[PDB]
């Protein structure tokens, strides 16, 4: 979630341009962003973002069942640019934005906006009202062509802040050996326990949460780190970059 990024990463964009959501949402899925080529100072403009995905395909949920996907994003604007205050956003734009609550990454980074999680069904496309700065009043900005960075996220991640894998990723054999048993946990918690007999006779038990499907069978020999399941992840994170020119009013 955006909060996972906020609580664990001071800056959402790394030196090489990678946005931190990618450290946990391990699958790539394209996104799109559009902003006007240019904007006058102290003016409200729209950033239209696209987070496409097949809405017919459900994902594995935290509870092990299948369900809809939720989305979120992080938008990195040039210093000085900020979310347009409600009083500056015309009715026609507020309607396009819908019931979304964009928030600054931190009180000290009002130029970085986030949103989510929100339903993918309704927000696979979003509009963000942005207010441009004024070089005449802000010396941290000038009349330049500035870059804008975007990260669009869909679906549950593969690893948590604590480093533990979620049930929405691949599970691998902890050791090489012969699978001597594949036990179904319960019927309410789901999941499995895969017993692997090593060459020395020791038996290790790999626990697999409900969600992923097994691709191995009893009696089958596996190598260390060999996948025991499929890759249930159907979501993805994508990045895009664009630009905008802050116009210099002439009179
Ligand atoms: C790892 C420390 C993470 C970072 C950094 C980010 N996300 Fe994440 N996200 C992560 C997990 C493991 C989960 C699943 C939680 C669960 O058990 O359900 C999520 C989930 C989301 C969601 C909800 C998706 C859904 O329910 O279908 C969204 C919209 C999402 N994450 C967005 C998001 C964005 C935009 C991030 C970067 C700014 C981001 N996440 C970082 C793990 C982590």
From Swiss-Prot:
Q: Does the keyword Acetylation apply?
A: no
What does the Swiss-Prot or TrEMBL cofactor note state?
A: Binds 1 heme group covalently.
List the cofactors.
heme
GO term, biological process aspect, one: photosynthesis
Does Electron transport count among this protein's keywords?
Answer: yes
Q: Name one GO molecular function term.
A: heme binding
- How would you summarize the oligomeric state and partners of this protein? The 4 large subunits of the cytochrome b6-f complex are cytochrome b6, subunit IV (17 kDa polypeptide, petD), cytochrome f and the Rieske protein, while the 4 small subunits are PetG, PetL, PetM and PetN. The complex functions as a dimer.
- The name of this protein is Cytochrome f
Q: Which residues of the full protein are shown?
A: 32 to 282 of 317
């Amino acid at each position: 979630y955006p909060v996972f990024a906020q609580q664990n990463y001071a800056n959402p964009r790394e030196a090489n341009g990678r946005i931190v959501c990618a450290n946990c949402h391990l699958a790539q899925k394209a996104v799109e962003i559009e902003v006007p080529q240019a904007v006058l100072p102290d003016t409200v403009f729209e950033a239209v973002i696209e987070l496409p995905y097949d809405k017919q395909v459900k994902q594995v949920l935290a509870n092990g069942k299948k369900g809809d996907l939720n989305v979120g994003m992080v938008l990195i604007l040039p210093e000085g640019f900020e979310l347009a205050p409600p009083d500056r956003v015309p009715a026609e734009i507020k309607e396009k934005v819908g019931n979304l609550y964009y928030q600054p990454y931190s009180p000290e980074q009002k130029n970085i906006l986030v949103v989510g999680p929100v339903p993918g069904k309704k927000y696979s496309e979003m509009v963000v009202p942005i207010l441009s700065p004024d070089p005449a009043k802000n010396k941290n900005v000038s009349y330049l062509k500035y870059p804008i960075y975007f990260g669009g996220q869909r679906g549950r991640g593969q690893v948590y802040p604590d480093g533990k894998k979620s049930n929405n990723t691949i599970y691998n054999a902890s050791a090489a050996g012969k699978i001597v048993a594949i036990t179904a946990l319960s019927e309410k918690k789901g999941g499995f326990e895969v017993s692997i007999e090593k060459a020395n006779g020791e038996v290790v038990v790999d626990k697999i949460p409900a969600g992923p499907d097994l691709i191995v069978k009893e009696g089958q020999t596996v190598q260390a780190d060999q996948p025991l399941t499929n890759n249930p992840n159907v979501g993805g994170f994508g990045q895009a970059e664009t630009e905008i020119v802050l116009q210099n009013p002439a009179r």
